Amino acid sequence: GLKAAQKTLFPLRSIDDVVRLFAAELGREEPDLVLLSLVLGFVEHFLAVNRVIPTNVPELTFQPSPAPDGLTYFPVADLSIIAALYARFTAQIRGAVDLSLYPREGGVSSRELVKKVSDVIWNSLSRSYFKDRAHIQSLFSFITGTKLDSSGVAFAVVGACQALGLRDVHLALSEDHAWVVFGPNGEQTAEVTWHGKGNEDRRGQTVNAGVAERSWLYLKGSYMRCDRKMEVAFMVCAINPSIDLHTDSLELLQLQQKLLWLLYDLGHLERYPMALGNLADLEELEPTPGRPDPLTLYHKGIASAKTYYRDEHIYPYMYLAGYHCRNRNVREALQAWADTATVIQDYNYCREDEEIYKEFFEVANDVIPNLLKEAASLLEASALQDPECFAHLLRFYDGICKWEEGSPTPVLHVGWATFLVQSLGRFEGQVRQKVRIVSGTVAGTARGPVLTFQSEKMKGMKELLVATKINSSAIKLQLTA
Numbered sequence: 149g150l151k152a153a154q155k156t157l158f159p160l161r162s163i164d165d166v167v168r169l170f171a172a173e174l175g176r177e178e179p180d181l182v183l184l185s186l187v188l189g190f191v192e193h194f195l196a197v198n199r200v201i202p203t204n205v206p207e208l209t210f211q212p213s214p215a216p217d218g219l220t221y222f223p224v225a226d227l228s229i230i231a232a233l234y235a236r237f238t239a240q241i242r243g244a245v246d247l248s249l250y251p252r253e254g255g256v257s258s259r260e261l262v263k264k265v266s267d268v269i270w271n272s273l274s275r276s277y278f279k280d281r282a283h284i285q286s287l288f289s290f291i292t293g294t295k296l297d298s299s300g301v302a303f304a305v306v307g308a309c310q311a312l313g314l315r316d317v318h319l320a321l322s323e324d325h326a327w328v329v330f331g332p333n334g335e336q337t338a339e340v341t342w343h344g345k346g347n348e349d350r351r352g353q354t355v356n357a358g359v360a361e362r363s364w365l366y367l368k369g370s371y372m373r374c375d376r377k378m379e380v381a382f383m384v385c386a387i388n389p390s391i392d393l394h395t396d397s398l399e400l401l402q403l404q405q406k407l408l409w410l411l412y413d414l415g416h417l418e419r420y421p422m423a424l425g426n427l428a429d430l431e432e433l434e435p436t437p438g439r440p441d442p443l444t445l446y447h448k449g450i451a452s453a454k455t456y457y458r459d460e461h462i463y464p465y466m467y468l469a470g471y472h473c474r475n476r477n478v479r480e481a482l483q484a485w486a487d488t489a490t491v492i493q494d495y496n497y498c499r500e501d502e503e504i505y506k507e508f509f510e511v512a513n514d515v516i517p518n519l520l521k522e523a524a525s526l527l528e529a530s531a532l533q534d535p536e537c538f539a540h541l542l543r544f545y546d547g548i549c550k551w552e553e554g555s556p557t558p559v560l561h562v563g564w565a566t567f568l569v570q571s572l573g574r575f576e577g578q579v580r581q582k583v584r585i586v587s588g589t590v591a592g593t594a595r596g597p598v599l600t601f602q603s604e605k606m607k608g609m610k611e612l613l614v615a616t617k618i619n620s621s622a623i624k625l626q627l628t629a
């Protein structure tokens with residue numbers, strides 16, 4: 149329910165008023181995910197979904213304030229609007245789940261209870277809507293339009309469990325999928341949403357098969373297990389400032405940035421690598437005085453992945469590579485992509501890993517070829533003269549090759565082979581042969597660049613990659629075999 153400590157912070161007439169609600173809620177023993185999700189969804193609806201201020205609606209008002217280059221109008225989050233939305237969600241869940249039929253074995257939720265709550269959210273959703281549609285992530289979307297995206301369903305099941313008083317059910321997250329963790333010690337797992345366009349319904353099952361398979365989608369078991377404070381962080385990361393494909397809401401960007409600094413200062417981003425990359429992206433768009441630089445924050449994201457997730461995360465390095473690409477730091481961008489491939493090499497490319505395959509396919513066959521083409525234009529009256537860039541390029545392909553090893557389906561096809569030959573060809577023979585590709589001589593220690601290939605394909609190509617005249621057919625045949 150909604151208590152006086154929560155209600156007295158209403159109405160929310162500004163960005164700072166919303167931040168104050170979150171600061172107060174994060175200080176409570178059990179932060180209300182439902183209330184916080186509804187507020188974000190309410191403000192996102194008028195700032196990005198439908199910006200046209202309503203004429204025939206009398207209770208709904210907007211708050212004017214000076215905009216940095218006339219006025220800007222903020223949707224006033226009234227207590228009557230939010231409390232009614234909150235009451236509707238609570239009434240729906242409590243009315244559909246009869247907790248007398250489920251024996252709570254000393255504050256522990258059974259699989260049967262978790263599956264019922266999952267079924268309630270699932271059966272409430274609209275029969276037909278676009279899944280990749282923007283702004284269908286919040287509980288406002290579930291209540292006002294019965295639409296939720298893939299990870300939104302997972303968050304809604306967790307929100308609904310908290311409303312029923314189930315403190316043991318928590319959000320589990322990978323870098324592209326969401327499920328729930330429950331039971332004593334939070335070692336019990338259950339699928340609550342779908343994944344992919346048409347990849348069937350594994351709802352109600354454990355994630356064991358996906359973890360044992362070594363797919364990037366289940367991160368070999370080193371996935372995030374959220375506490376209530378991390379579920380608030382997920383919800384803040386989930387804020388979508390997009391108005392259309394090319395424009396953003398300046399208020400939603402400012403709100404997400406302020407909310408991320410709030411979570412950071414309380415230490416709730418310490419185990420959330422992608423939130424730190426998101427904050428760094430926001431800091432580059434609008435730096436806030438006295439705060440650390442985007443580069444410091446990207447490396448804080450990588451450090452978190454290394455410390456708490458045994459360096460098995462892809463996107464922290466991807467975020468850093470993104471920064472260097474935008475700023476045209478060819479060496480530093482290629483280094484970060486090679487570091488991404490060093491992570492993916494110990495995974496097996498499975499059917500449902502399309503999201504990360506598409507990301508690597510685009511860097512290897514569009515982004516990197518575009519970078520080296522632009523660099524070649526600049527040489528006609530520098531990075532292509534650096535043998536370190538060439539070593540980063542080879543380590544990147546080494547990672548993709550090793551990733552393909554032990555995989556049920558191939559990664560590299562004729563489409564990749566062309567861009568490898570073209571990218572190798574962007575570096576002169578003299579620059580390419582400066583790189584020493586060694587296996588090592590002695591193991592351990594007693595009391596031009598150097599590179600070691602972990603993959604069979606790049607090892608067999610060793611001499612060809614360094615030869616003055618590139619044998620295209622042989623390099624293409626070995627990469628695609």
Ligand SMILES: *CCC(=O)N1C[C@@H]2C[C@H]1CN2S(=O)(=O)c1ccc(N2CC(CN3CCC([C@@](CN4CCC4)(c4cccc(F)c4)[C@H]4CCC[C@@H]4NC(=O)OC)CC3)(OC)C2)cc1
Pocket residue numbers: 285298299321322323324325326382385386422423426463466467469470471473474503507508510511515
């Ligand atoms: C020169 C620059 C250039 O051309 N390019 C091309 C691209 C961009 C730039 C550099 N390259 S790149 O190196 O190939 C590259 C860099 C960075 C990224 N991205 C990070 C990104 C995606 N995040 C991953 C997490 C999601 C998540 C939604 N997913 C997307 C499909 C569904 C999600 C997270 C976890 C579990 C999930 F099930 C889903 C959302 C759901 C709600 C919260 C969550 N987001 C966060 O946690 O945010 C921190 C989206 C964010 O960020 C934009 C793209 C890719 C390539």
